[PDB]
């Protein structure tokens, strides 16, 4: 079974997964599995109630979301959780009539797994939406970095700086929060390293632009050389943001 993708998902699903595995083990053990199971109608109904609620709140997200991919991917998870739930309800019925029911025991395990599995999909789907939001911020900064090439005057540069400053701060904060959430250390490191390189290069870009603007306006020698440092800085930063974008979308083999 796969490692969960973020610390949040892991803290949510890990206890459940653990109890279910415990339940499978008990089931596969003849003497304990063969004992009478008491009436599960009330706890199962409580689970169904909670599934109903989860699905109501889910459908509300569906109608009111911007993300079309979210609209597409969430409903199958609802279906999966509700279907798993009917297995639990059926098990409770069977056991009420026969505490020794074998099919009931199978439904208990299958229903539980189904709820885990579908809740997992639902969480992965919300998580992928969150990542798409981060990526949109990243992509804006990419586009804006292409605009650096047309700053010609000190007044453009102040304006550019006034905008790039915040946008970079926003991306940095988002990436810092996201990396702390990851359960894969290698991914956290790549994110941190890349974001740090981008943070380091930002005042270098501004300098390189100031130098370009100054030599452009002072009609001085070596504007061609200022152009070079400015372009390199935009290229390097962009390469690094595209690497952040690539890493934000990684799921490692132990998840699939």
């Amino acid at each position: 079974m796969p490692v969960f993708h973020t610390r949040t998902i892991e803290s949510i699903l890990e206890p459940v997964a653990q109890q279910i595995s415990h339940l499978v083990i008990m089931h596969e053990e003849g003497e304990v599995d063969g004992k009478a199971i008491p009436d599960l109608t009330a706890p199962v109904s409580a689970v169904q109630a909670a599934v109903s609620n989860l699905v109501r709140v889910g459908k509300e997200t569906v109608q009111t979301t911007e993300d079309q991919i979210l609209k597409r991917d969430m409903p199958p998870a609802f279906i999966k959780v509700e279907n798993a739930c009917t297995k639990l309800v059926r098990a409770a019925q069977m056991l009420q009539a026969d505490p020794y029911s074998v099919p009931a025991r199978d439904y208990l395990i299958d229903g539980s797994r189904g709820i885990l599995s579908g809740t997992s999909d639902l969480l992965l789907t919300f998580d992928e939406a969150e990542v798409r939001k981060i990526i949109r911020v990243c992509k804006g900064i990419l586009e804006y970095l292409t605009v650096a090439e047309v700053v010609e005057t000190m007044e453009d540069l102040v304006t550019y700086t006034k905008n790039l400053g915040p946008g970079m701060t926003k991306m940095a904060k988002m990436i810092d929060e996201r990396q702390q959430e990851l359960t894969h250390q290698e991914h956290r490191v790549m994110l941190v390293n890349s974001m740090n390189t981008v943070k380091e290069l930002l005042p270098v870009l501004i300098s390189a632009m100031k130098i370009f603007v100054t030599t452009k306006n002072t009609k001085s020698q070596g504007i061609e050389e200022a152009l070079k440092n400015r372009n390199f800085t935009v290229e390097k930063m962009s390469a690094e943001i595209n690497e952040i974008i690539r890493v934000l979308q990684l799921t490692s083999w132990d998840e699939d």
Binding site: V16, V47, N53
Partner: peptide, 26 residues
């Protein structure tokens, strides 16, 4: 309300496994 619904769902799941004696009997 989204997070509370997960909490509650996995909470009931927890209790149900307990009814099966998961971490209470066996």
């Amino acid at each position: 309300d989204i997070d509370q619904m997960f909490s509650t769902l996995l909470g009931e799941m927890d209790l149900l496994t307990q009814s099966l004696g998961v971490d209470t009997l066996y």
